[PDB]
Amino acid sequence: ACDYTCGSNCYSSSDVSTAQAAGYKLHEDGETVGSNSYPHEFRNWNGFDFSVSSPYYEYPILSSGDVYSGGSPGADRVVFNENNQLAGVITHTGASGNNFVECT
């Protein structure tokens, strides 16, 4: 099985690291990309029990394996914190409204 499965997208740990790394660089630099300004704070309204400290930040992870650069973000997000630690991988797919479910 894939390291991470979001909806029908299969992601490896390196895929996640790659998206995480792109998101983190933008974060430490105070910059963003896309009409929705990624990365931005992940509010965790769904109450996921992450083991790393908050605040959390979400950055899109794309089904093409490409690093997000401002297009349509799709449903998948990697969540990380200012210590550059991976909090988790989440997706809108399978959820209702603006809610999220953790990828499996």
Ordered domains of the chain (ranges, CATH): 1-104 (3.10.450.30)
Q: Is 92 in the active site?
A: yes
CB-based contacts of 94, cutoff 8 Å, min separation 6: 7, 101
* Catalytic residue (choose from 31, 40, 82, 92): 92
CB-based contacts of 97, cutoff 8 Å, min separation 6: none
Of 61, 60, 56, give the one whose Cα is nearest residue 44.
56
Q: Is 58 in the active site?
A: yes
Whats the size of the chain, residue-wise?
A: 104
Q: Are 70 and 56 in contact (CB under 8 A)?
A: no
Of 95, 102, 85, give the one whose Cα is nearest residue 17.
85
* Catalytic residue (choose from 27, 40, 41, 58): 58
Q: Are 34 and 71 in contact (CB under 8 A)?
A: yes
* Structure token digits, residue 3: 């390291």
The β-bridge partners of 91 are 76, 101
